[PDB]
Design an enzyme around this catalytic site. Structure first.
Site, mmCIF file in Angstrom:
data_model
loop_
_atom_site.group_PDB
_atom_site.id
_atom_site.type_symbol
_atom_site.label_atom_id
_atom_site.label_comp_id
_atom_site.label_asym_id
_atom_site.label_seq_id
_atom_site.Cartn_x
_atom_site.Cartn_y
_atom_site.Cartn_z
ATOM 1 N N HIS A 133 -7.709 -4.859 -0.700
ATOM 2 C CA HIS A 133 -6.469 -4.192 -0.048
ATOM 3 C C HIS A 133 -6.016 -4.660 1.248
ATOM 4 O O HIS A 133 -4.567 -4.423 1.292
ATOM 5 C CB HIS A 133 -6.679 -2.789 -0.200
ATOM 6 C CG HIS A 133 -5.434 -1.911 -0.114
ATOM 7 N ND1 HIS A 133 -4.892 -1.908 -0.969
ATOM 8 C CD2 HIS A 133 -5.128 -1.091 0.792
ATOM 9 C CE1 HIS A 133 -3.661 -1.206 -1.018
ATOM 10 N NE2 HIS A 133 -3.883 -0.548 0.348
ATOM 11 N N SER B 174 0.702 -1.196 -0.090
ATOM 12 C CA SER B 174 0.046 -0.116 0.014
ATOM 13 C C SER B 174 0.879 1.124 -0.097
ATOM 14 O O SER B 174 1.784 1.376 -0.872
ATOM 15 C CB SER B 174 -0.868 0.009 1.315
ATOM 16 O OG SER B 174 -1.882 0.888 1.062
ATOM 17 N N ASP C 268 -8.903 -6.187 -5.177
ATOM 18 C CA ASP C 268 -8.653 -4.849 -4.281
ATOM 19 C C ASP C 268 -9.533 -3.691 -4.908
ATOM 20 O O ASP C 268 -9.709 -3.277 -5.797
ATOM 21 C CB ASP C 268 -7.054 -4.549 -4.495
ATOM 22 C CG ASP C 268 -6.537 -3.295 -3.530
ATOM 23 O OD1 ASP C 268 -7.266 -2.323 -3.389
ATOM 24 O OD2 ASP C 268 -5.315 -3.337 -3.319
#
Lengths: 357, 357
Positions: A336, A142, A303
């Site tokens: 995610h 991320s 995601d």
């Protein structure tokens, strides 16, 4: 038991967007044992709300707990890991809640705008302090993947391997939109006081709402359907928590307030959505053409924040600059958050990424 | 030039969740000409923020303007359309901003909780007033599709055709989550005053934030990438609008305040997420087995709010109850808003739906 070092004391950090910071404390932790060759060092870069402590051995759970330890993907028998809280953070490294050396009060509204390029310069200075002159790998997911990407550009020969989990080199329009709503929720809290709230009531309402929204982007609709579906709270309220999913979001939003600062959240959201690997270079192609490391990029197909469209745009840009790229993708209910949860699917990717496979 | 009628004067409306409403004004509009057979009447049910006026012929644009008119899918040369503002609305039909007959002040915090079952009872009473004893069709998208679904259950022999665009019979866990964040943004506005804000400053900050969030669920990430990508505002601000997408969201959030009431938004969000076609029946199978109409259900495959998973769950439930079901699907950049924008893909579905094809 976080370690600390004050850097940029005799020479300030010049920030990309202008202005300067002095007396930057960096909170950090190390794990494992640096070998005699000193060739097994790995930098871990944390995500938006992460900190310097991915792992504890004493019973506590760090933010990457089940991925890290003896014989695990982040193998503490094999590597010497360094993990640090980012500039602009709120878990030990200088950020907006820190005391401004020039006023004796928290920076608050006076904290300068920062970008990933600044964050990595602080990390470089930390490694210089620690006497680490080369890395086996840098790994992050991320926002941590953006830090890893930026390292690959700015210090191209400093690491063997880059492991970028679930990030693109540019944040999407839609994702910017979510960040914008989150920022506005915080800034419009009646207690925000333009960011100088440290002597009064903190902006808990706005921050908890922002966090709830963030959480809705981090997993998948399927995961929420599995966890809660339409289960109801036994004595709910119409304007409060009625469904179990609402109860959960409210509880987690409140719990977040115990560990995070609103101003830090604003500064890091902006670093995330503004991230531009071309900054300080002629253009993105020139920047990415600097990358020499073996670069692993992982896309989670489900995601909902860094969507496949973004990961493929990144894949293409990296290929166009001749990066030594190794791209992998797979679905996960955790979307995610999968790089923090889905050990079964990430274990091999991480193990291989760190080792140069 | 909306029409109005006061209903439930001599006998109150008994609400599903308890308590009662009297002196319900219904704002409505009619279009086209009822034929001698009176067999060409169509009820239009509006979506969350819609109103009684989908169409104008004088230069103004109604909420379904380009889908409706002479020779268009909603063919005003062919059908007699009735369109009404829902109970709990803020564009003429009794809602929380209306004067409470018992106090002479707006209902505000005293407005009772309503559900789609109540909304359709008000619509039935309107059609009784207008002397419409049968319908050729009922059509609605999104929250309007839920109203159409509920009509199909409660008054099974009252209409030939049901045209449900882009709604499921249950709202998903994730979608509930977004509604929850939107409600909390409103309720935590410093001017909300528990819903009794009508004599002071309205909760503009919270409502505009809620609207921005809603908008991020109504289209697709691809559409936003096409419209804006990462274009920047020329003299932006870090804590305000920096990217063009942020400028757009802020502008639209502000514009929304000119046309909508915060309390109405709260009440209709709850009607939407609480919607349960089994309410008042033994179970969902028993409820759906009542449906006799020719039922058209359209799924937009790229819808980010009523996702294909929900549309397929609905499809299955309707099939399990032996509904005369006709299911169609297609992708659109406009996602959940496609039924209001993507005329090329909806024209035939609407035309055929209304006509019994």
């Amino acid at each position: 038991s976080v370690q600390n070092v004050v850097l940029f004391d005799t020479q300030p950090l010049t920030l990309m967007l202008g202005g300067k910071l002095s007396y930057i404390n960096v909170a950090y932790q190390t794990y494992g044992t640096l070998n005699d060759e000193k060739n097994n060092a790995v930098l871990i870069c944390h995500a938006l709300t992460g900190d310097a402590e991915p792992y504890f051995d004493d019973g506590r759970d760090g933010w990457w707990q089940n991925f890290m330890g003896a014989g695990l993907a982040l193998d503490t028998d094999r590597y010497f890991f360094i993990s640090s809280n980012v500039l602009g953070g709120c878990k030990g490294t200088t950020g907006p809640s820190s005391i401004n050396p020039q006023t004796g009060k928290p920076y608050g509204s006076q904290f300068p705008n920062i970008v990933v390029q600044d964050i990595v310069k602080v990390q470089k200075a930390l490694l210089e302090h620690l006497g680490i002159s080369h890395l086996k790998a840098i790994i992050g997911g991320s926002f941590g993947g953006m830090q890893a990407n930026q390292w690959a550009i700015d210090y191209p020969d400093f690491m063997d391997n880059i492991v970028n989990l679930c990030s693109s080199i540019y944040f999407s329009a839609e994702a910017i939109g979510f960040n914008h709503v989150m920022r506005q929720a915080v800034i419009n809290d009646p207690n925000f006081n333009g960011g100088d709230y440290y002597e009064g009531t903190p902006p808990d309402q706005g921050l908890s709402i922002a966090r709830m929204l963030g959480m809705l982007t981090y997993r998948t609709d399927l995961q929420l359907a599995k966890a809660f579906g339409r289960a109801t709270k036994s004595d709910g309220s119409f304007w409060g928590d009625y469904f179990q999913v609402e109860s959960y979001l409210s509880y987690q939003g409140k719990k977040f307030l115990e560990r995070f600062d609103a101003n830090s959240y604003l500064h890091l959201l902006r670093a995330l959505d503004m991230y531009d690997p071309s900054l300080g270079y002629e253009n993105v192609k020139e920047a990415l053409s600097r990358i020499k490391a073996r670069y692993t990029l992982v896309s989670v197909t489900t995601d909902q924040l860094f969507k496949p469209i973004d990961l493929y745009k990144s894949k293409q840009l990296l290929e166009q600059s001749g990066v030594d790229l190794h791209f992998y993708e797979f679905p996960s209910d955790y979307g995610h958050d999968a790089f923090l949860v889905d050990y079964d699917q990430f274990e091999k990717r991480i193990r291989d990424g760190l080792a140069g496979n």
